[PDB]
Design a protein around this ligand. Structure first.
Ligand SMILES: Nc1ncnc2c1ncn2[C@@H]1O[C@@H]2COP(=O)(O)O[C@H]2[C@H]1O
Ligand SMILES: Nc1ncnc2c1ncn2[C@@H]1O[C@@H]2COP(=O)(O)O[C@H]2[C@H]1O
Ligand SMILES: Nc1ncnc2c1ncn2[C@@H]1O[C@@H]2COP(=O)(O)O[C@H]2[C@H]1O
Ligand SMILES: Nc1ncnc2c1ncn2[C@@H]1O[C@@H]2COP(=O)(O)O[C@H]2[C@H]1O
Ligand SMILES: [Ca+2]
Ligand SMILES: [Ca+2]
Lengths: 450, 432, 446, 446
């Protein structure tokens, strides 16, 4: 079998790869800096060590079985994939990532964490899995906070390991800045050794301060670098975190946009309190039912061919119930979803009034509309959903009285959403399908009779 | 001056500056005299003299300068003095002025004198309109707000230190040295949230520090954020050009465009930014209204379009129409503006720089070297059916700016004036 | 038997009634449990407040069962339909568990923590108030300050709870011994713990250093979530004020751009002074905002009908619209666009082709002739002009050309109507141009 | 006579030659003045280097006299004009003051402080390098870091100079006495002052408290400057690093917007993957950036040269191109637009009127029957189809409609040219129409 980078099986392998990498990123520097950590759990490290190298070996085999897209067609031939892979710089990096240190492992010592530093070269594989997860995740903003929090903890962990490493070289108990003497009962344990280093690293990096003053020239240099790292690099991560909040702000601005902009223009004009109340009541609805004000801007991002298909599945229940639609070949549907325009109507608002030239097809996506007489005392009928009205005005009907003018005025009973389609556009739809012309002709002449 | 125009009167701007100075004196010296014991029976005479001068200028503003101010109503400017006084009376500004000027020795008795901030805002707006490079003044006013906040905290800290026993606790101010400097030091450490102060002991000290730190984090962040907004808005244009150039260079490096073309694109970008001060001025043109954009176009290009050989005095209205239609794009040096083979679709007017008409055996010769305020390319556009090609190649001797008139737009203005069209074609035929 | 309307103001009033007990339960339950002196001293106060809160929680069951829902654009009065909508969703199980009895000590507050699960009504009130209020930015700041003050209050209770588990006075980090009279009274305990949490959460520092290993882990965790809070305070509060002043900043950016264009083009001062005056005119009267840009999101039927209300005084003053009494006004008002002209600028000139008809809204326009010092006629607001030129008539002295110059004596605001939109109106009503021709004829010999 | 071109590479090299003595004077002269031990140990090192900086400065006067400026769009080579232009500027006065030897008016840093006035070359070199460097984002980070380090270095020297004025060891705030061997050497005194300046400017920790009133003024001045200027430079660095990941953000910001759309609309899970798969293809090949928006500033001629060289392989395969007229190559590349199609998507449908023609840039298309499995002819790279619909053929069997449907196999990228735009190129050049019509006649017989 040959894996597909677009396939889900390759994505699950990327998420599996990050666990050996994270152990390689965090534990190895901790083992090198802390001598008691290596000797304490020597058996437990080797079991997790060999699993990490075997996973790295398996990643090499997967790379040879992952196809690449040439001319838009996936390649399944293993010979041509291998020729591409060895040309790439990743294979050279991956060879050095698992470059065998066992030949020099025994000479340096029994086990040396410092020799396995070449495992750091597999880090680009981790970053690729972060990118692939973020695109297909259900909650993107939660992942960005989690990813930025992971970078914070690693940076503090590396700085805490360096502080303990410098303390051991200078000597414990030399002054107040360095790690205290292990003769103290609290600081004897290994658990205190890390917690104190992490607490010391947290104070500097997060700009809290409250640290013992340095006493030696080496310690002054270490604090200058840590202060300088905190002011820019830490502020960069928190600067990115504020953008994630601002991204949520933009999403909140996407919901009912320009709500305050409407209010300030209305309030300054103060033309009428009743017209203001209708605007507020309409705007307040769309927060409750949670309609997007404009979906056309969202669909604009998608390509035109994919724009029509996505809109088909959203309104599929409406399209099927229309007696016009799906005449033959199921191909008229792609043309009409793009041309249709959504509209929302308030109760008592006449969609089109009698004696007016109407240009809109007015298919009913949702909501009940009752056609009514001009006096309004009696309603001829009510249209539940998925029905057409006003189509007589667009089509040319032989022997039609006041063909441009609407015979009846229709009033929306409750809140309703409609799709309106222009006259010139409907003539294009009729020109493609002769059957649609017949249905308009027979239905439009019957209502004229009654 | 019986009538003062608020928008343009330098005298009015100066008077607003004086009123702002008096208001600043009041708003800065009221906390110090209220909290610190800087008011002595000897110094009180100087204090009353300064306060009397400030009250005098406050009174004179209302009496004269706010009474005499021209206004508009229904698009009509009014100079009448009684109507001016009535309009000043019917305003929020008069209400604020009288509320500040109500009389109401306690240094806190003059507290309603700081209600005059309409004067401060109008002075800010007037200096912001008149003075060029006002971003530095934006920075100055923002940092002045921050320093004023520090001042209030320094005075509040001294007030708390006076309310408790001086030197009773480590938090409370001991009293040695200059009082304002040490209290200001306490303010700087707490507001910037630096830390290192002696810890509070008494509940009053604890609640003081807790409120000071809380207000400090929120307000200080807002003041710093406003400073970042001001400096970003100052550098926004350079950021815009740098982003566009970075994107273009990154794209052209990604697609492996040759280095000569890359260098020519970079040179064009650099030269047009240094010369124009902007990239793609058409967008700013469409943000501006139609009449103002047209009037700007006439004002900038009337001399160039009027001093041409083809259309001199033929039709003033057609001159205005071409002032609407003309656009400009810089041409790089040694570039061919037109080639003999290509069909001619555009008319070029040289705003600046020198272009050389190339004609001769194997070309490579200069017949006429055109200068600024000249036209070329008319033969291909104005011919029998328009099918005639360009007669000779034209190149830029160096960096040059050309005014481009489209064939369709020029023909559109020609169908309205066939009489001037006849003369223009007659001259174009006489050239050949 | 009543069905509450979700859109009604009575539902919003009930949202305020439910929100206060939820806010009381969040702020005080974690403070009553951790501070033993708070529960004992004010035991009579908590009994009344808990009983008041418990009725409001129970009263929310009856309201939520009778809360209406919009199906097919119409609300439902059926009790069965309302019951089936709410008794099946997850909120009913959460709401029932909020009001389960604690009999299975009752007066103690650690057993009444089940009232915290009704946080849905708390978040809905803040969301609903933002839309209804006139000033959303200041309310958003007030909502965010309330959120931050809860965590600081919640952190203070946890810090005192940890100190009670370890023991007071056994090390420097914990709160000092309660038996000591200085630290005994409750006001000292609550303020200092609130003072302690604010310093740690906002990364102030100055807290006493931890001594034992368990205290190290809590302090490190408090700092890490503290920088999350500091990102919100810098981010949200800084952005709300920045977005509050976004209207002024856009206009100021435009002025600087035109000024930069002034230097590059070497524009004459008199034109430059004219440009900055006209900008200053718009800024003072606050007419720089365009209604067609703001109202473009709002659907067309309501958008058209609010526009007839804003210009109702001018449209009623139009003799053309009032006399015909036809239906062309509803579509033409949307086509109509505003234009502002500076004083001394000639809107129309004789010998110039005309493509638009202009209706004055607020301006003292003059029909000037020759130099322009003398005026052929005087024109007032609400009077249309230029309609003889764009509608060509066979019996005309001149065609598609202005007969007389039109100039603005002062700052004039008028409305422009293009020729093509008038052609659209002609397809609806062709009788209007014939009446206009007869009035247009008498202008020609005069 | 030698005239140096300002935009040439020789002038850019000289900007680097003058910048290093300016940077040497700006960073090390203040350190030599404050730290007295720095000269006395290294007197011979500074004497040789300072003579080098003086020689470059005077040579800069001669070079600036021979630099060229642009007049009337043409570089000026007249030496008299270059001399007349330079002298009138204020910059010539500053460069004159840099080279005047104050020693003739002892060898010490304070008498050589006049050479700091030649700082204009340093800022010009940084501006010129940023435009010509490969990655301007990493360079602008390094430029702002250099300003950060200089401010810290200067503030460290001021603190050491202030301590010497007040006295060493007189109080806790000042540097302790040099006479003590522990504190009295060059390595410690620069390093501790660097640590003091870094801690004070960044406002990260607490120095020993000031004692005298003058020391309070300097600490307040240092803290305010650090917040007002040093923090602003830091904030500029942090924002621009986030701008590097912002190029990933706006493509993602499209994705989060639309993913929220289908989540609310409850789109089927089968169509959930198709949109995600299409989005994953765009970022894998990094095709989400559109050249129309990114190259809108360049004129038509410069855009034409870029468009030809980007798609040189594809444009050479088109039958309408490589013609002797060559007007199609210049004109059509601006009108052409790209589009990417999913596998199995129908490029065109049989029996439908076509508004455009297509050229293959990358991908494989196969013309198919109703079933779609059967294939008639394979459309290779660079093939142009759609000529039958746009151009009418004599006696067309399909009546100017598309003869057969085309189905895409795998991903494909298509360049589309609208019929109206093509018809313009038909009218200008008749021969290009005939060669397309001749191709259509052959395929109509098939
Ligand atoms: N009794 C009815 N039943 C269904 N539809 C109707 C009835 N009366 C009017 N209509 C619709 O209402 C429309 C009003 O305008 P039209 O005359 O164009 O076409 C009309 C029909 O589509
Ligand atoms: N002898 C000449 N003197 C001046 N200008 C010329 C001469 N020959 C050609 N030109 C100009 O060069 C232009 C080249 O293109 P056109 O033929 O469109 O129009 C031409 C004239 O404007
Ligand atoms: N004597 C007049 N009385 C009233 N209105 C006039 C007079 N002369 C011109 N106008 C108006 O001024 C307008 C100027 O342009 P028009 O000629 O298009 O249409 C003209 C009329 O509307
Ligand atoms: N059998 C075929 N061989 C090659 N090309 C074809 C064949 N059938 C259709 N085409 C191409 O597909 C195109 C579809 O639209 P047109 O009819 O405009 O022009 C058509 C031809 O370019
Ligand atoms: Ca801090
Ligand atoms: Ca601190």
């Amino acid at each position: 079998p040959v894996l597909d980078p677009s396939g889900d099986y390759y994505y699950w392998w990327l998420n599996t790869m990050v666990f050996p990498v994270m152990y390689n990123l965090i534990i190895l520097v901790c083992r090198a800096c802390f001598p008691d950590l290596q000797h304490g759990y020597l058996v437990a490290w080797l079991v997790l060590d060999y699993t990490s190298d075997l996973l790295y070996l398996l990643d090499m085999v997967v790379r040879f079985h992952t196809g690449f897209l040439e001319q838009g067609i996936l390649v399944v031939d293993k010979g041509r994939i291998s020729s591409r892979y060895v040309r790439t710089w990743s294979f050279f990096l991956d060879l050095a990532s698992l470059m065998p240190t066992d030949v020099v492992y025994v000479r340096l010592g029994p086990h040396t964490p410092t020799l396995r530093l070449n495992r750091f070269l597999r880090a680009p594989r981790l970053f690729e899995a972060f990118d692939r997860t973020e695109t297909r995740t259900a909650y993107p903003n939660a992942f960005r906070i989690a990813k930025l929090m992971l970078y914070i903890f690693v940076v503090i962990h590396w700085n805490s390991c360096l502080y303990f490493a410098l303390s051991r070289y200078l000597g414990f108990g030399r002054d107040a800045w360095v790690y205290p003497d292990p003769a103290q009962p609290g600081f004897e344990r290994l658990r205190r050794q890390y917690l104190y280093s992490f607490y010391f690293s947290t104070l500097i990096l997060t700009t809290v301060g409250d640290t013992p003053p340095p006493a030696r020239e080496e310690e002054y240099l270490f604090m200058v670098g840590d202060f300088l790292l905190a002011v820019m690099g830490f502020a960069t991560i928190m600067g990115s975190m504020s953008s994630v909040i601002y991204n949520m702000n933009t999403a909140d601005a996407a919901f009912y946009p320009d709500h305050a902009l409407v209010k300030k223009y209305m309030k300054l004009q103060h033309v009428n309190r009743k017209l203001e109340r209708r605007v507020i009541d309409w705007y307040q609805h769309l927060q409750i039912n949670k309609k997007m004000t404009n979906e056309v801007a969202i669909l604009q991002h998608l390509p035109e061919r994919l724009r029509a298909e996505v809109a088909v599945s959203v309104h599929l229940s409406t399209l099927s119930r229309v007696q016009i639609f799906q005449n033959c070949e199921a191909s008229l549907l792609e043309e009409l979803v793009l041309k249709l325009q959504p509209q929302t109507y308030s109760p008592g608002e006449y969609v089109c009034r009698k004696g007016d030239i109407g240009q809109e097809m007015y298919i009913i996506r949702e909501g009940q509309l009752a056609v009514v007489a001009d006096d309004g005392i009696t309603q001829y009928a009510v249209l539940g959903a998925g029905l057409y009205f006003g189509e007589i005005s667009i089509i040319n009907i032989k022997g039609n009285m006041s063909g441009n003018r609407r015979t009846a005025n229709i009033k929306s009973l409750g809140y309703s959403d409609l799709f309106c389609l222009s006259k010139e556009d409907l003539r294009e739809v009729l020109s493609e399908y002769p059957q649609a012309q017949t249905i308009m002709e027979e239905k439009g002449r019957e209502i004229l009779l009654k | 001056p019986q009538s003062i125009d608020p928008l343009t009167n330098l005298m009015y701007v100066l008077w607003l500056f004086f009123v702002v100075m008096a208001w600043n004196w009041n708003c800065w010296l009221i906390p110090v005299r209220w909290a610190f014991p800087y008011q002595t029976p000897d110094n009180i005479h100087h204090w009353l003299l300064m306060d009397y001068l400030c009250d005098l200028i406050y009174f004179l503003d209302i009496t004269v300068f706010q009474t005499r101010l021209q206004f508009v109503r229904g698009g009509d400017i009014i100079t009448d003095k009684k109507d001016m006084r009535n309009n000043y009376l019917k305003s929020r500004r008069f209400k604020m002025d009288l509320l500040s000027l109500l009389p109401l020795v306690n240094p806190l008795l003059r507290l309603p004198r700081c209600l005059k901030y309409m004067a401060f805002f109008e002075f800010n707006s007037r200096l912001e309109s008149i003075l060029s490079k006002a971003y530095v003044y934006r920075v100055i006013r923002t940092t002045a707000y921050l320093l004023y906040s520090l001042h209030l905290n320094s005075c509040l800290y001294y007030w708390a230190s006076a309310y408790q026993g001086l030197g009773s606790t480590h938090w409370v101010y001991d009293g040695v040295g200059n009082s304002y400097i040490r209290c200001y030091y306490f303010a700087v450490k707490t507001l910037i949230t630096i830390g290192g102060l002696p810890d509070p002991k008494t509940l009053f000290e604890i609640v003081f520090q807790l409120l000071n730190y809380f207000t400090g984090v929120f307000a200080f962040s807002v003041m710093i954020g406003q400073m970042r907004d001001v400096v970003g808005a100052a550098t926004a244009g350079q950021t815009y050009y740098r982003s566009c150039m970075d994107s273009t260079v990154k794209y052209m490096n990604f697609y492996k465009i040759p280095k000569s073309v890359q260098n020519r694109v970079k040179t064009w970008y650099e030269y047009t930014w240094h010369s124009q001060g902007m990239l793609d001025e058409s967008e700013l043109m469409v943000q501006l209204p139609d009449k103002m954009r047209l009037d700007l176009a006439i004002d900038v290009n009337y001399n160039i379009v009027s001093k041409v050989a083809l259309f001199q005095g033929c039709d003033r209205q057609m001159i205005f129409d071409m002032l609407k239609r003309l656009r400009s794009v810089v041409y790089l040096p040694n570039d061919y503006v037109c080639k003999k083979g290509e069909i001619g679709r555009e008319m070029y007017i040289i705003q600046a720089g020198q272009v050389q008409v190339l004609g001769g055996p194997d070309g490579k010769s200069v017949l006429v070297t055109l200068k600024a305020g000249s036209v070329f390319g008319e033969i291909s556009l104005l011919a029998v059916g328009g099918g005639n090609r360009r007669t000779a190649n034209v190149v830029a001797h160096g960096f040059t700016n050309l005014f481009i008139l489209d064939k369709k737009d020029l023909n559109e203005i020609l169908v309205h004036y066939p009489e001037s069209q006849k003369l223009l074609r007659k001259k174009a035929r006489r050239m050949l | 038997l009543f069905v509450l309307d979700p859109a009604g103001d009575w539902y919003y009033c009930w949202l305020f009634v439910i929100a206060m007990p939820v806010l009381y339960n969040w702020c005080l339950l974690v403070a009553r449990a951790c501070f033993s002196d708070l529960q004992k001293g004010y035991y009579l106060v908590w009994l009344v407040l808990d009983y008041v809160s418990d009725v409001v929680y129970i009263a929310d069951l009856f309201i939520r069962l009778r809360t209406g829902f919009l199906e097919q654009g119409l609300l439902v009065k059926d009790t069965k339909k309302l019951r089936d909508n709410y008794i099946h969703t997850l909120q009913f199980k959460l709401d029932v568990a909020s009001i389960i009895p604690t009999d299975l000590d009752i007066h103690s507050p650690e057993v009444r923590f089940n009232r915290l699960l009704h946080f849905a009504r708390m978040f809905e009130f803040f969301d609903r108030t933002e839309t209804r209020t006139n000033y959303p930015n200041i309310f958003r700041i007030s909502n965010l300050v309330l959120y931050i003050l809860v965590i600081i209050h919640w952190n203070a209770c946890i810090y005192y709870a940890i100190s009670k588990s370890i023991g007071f006075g056994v090390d420097t980090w914990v709160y000092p011994n309660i038996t000591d009279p200085e630290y005994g009274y409750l006001a000292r305990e609550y303020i200092y713990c609130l003072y302690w949490s604010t310093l740690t959460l906002t990364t102030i520092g100055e807290t006493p250093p931890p001594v034992k290993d368990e205290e190290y882990l809590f302090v490190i965790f408090d700092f890490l979530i503290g920088v999350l809070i500091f990102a919100t305070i810098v981010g949200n509060v800084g952005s709300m004020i920045s977005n509050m002043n976004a209207t002024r900043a856009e206009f100021q950016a435009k002025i600087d751009a035109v000024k930069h264009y002034m230097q590059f083009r070497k524009v004459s001062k008199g034109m430059e002074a004219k440009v900055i005056r006209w900008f200053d005119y718009l800024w003072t009267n606050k007419k720089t905002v365009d209604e067609r840009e703001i109202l473009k999101n709002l659907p067309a039927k309501l958008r058209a009908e609010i526009a007839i209300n804003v210009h109702l005084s001018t449209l009623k003053k139009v003799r053309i619209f009032h006399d015909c009494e036809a239906g062309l006004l509803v579509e033409l008002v949307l086509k109509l666009r505003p234009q502002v002209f500076s004083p001394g600028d000639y809107i129309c000139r004789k010998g110039d082709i005309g493509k638009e008809m202009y209706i004055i809204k607020e301006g003292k326009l003059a029909v000037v002739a020759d130099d322009g010092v003398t005026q052929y006629a005087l024109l007032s607001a609400g009077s249309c002009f230029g309609e003889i030129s764009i509608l060509n008539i066979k019996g005309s002295k001149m065609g598609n050309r202005r007969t007389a110059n039109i100039r603005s004596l002062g700052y004039s605001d008028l409305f422009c109507l293009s020729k093509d939109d008038l052609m659209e109106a002609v397809t609806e009503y062709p009788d209007a141009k014939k009446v206009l021709e007869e009035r247009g004829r008498e202008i020609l010999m005069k």
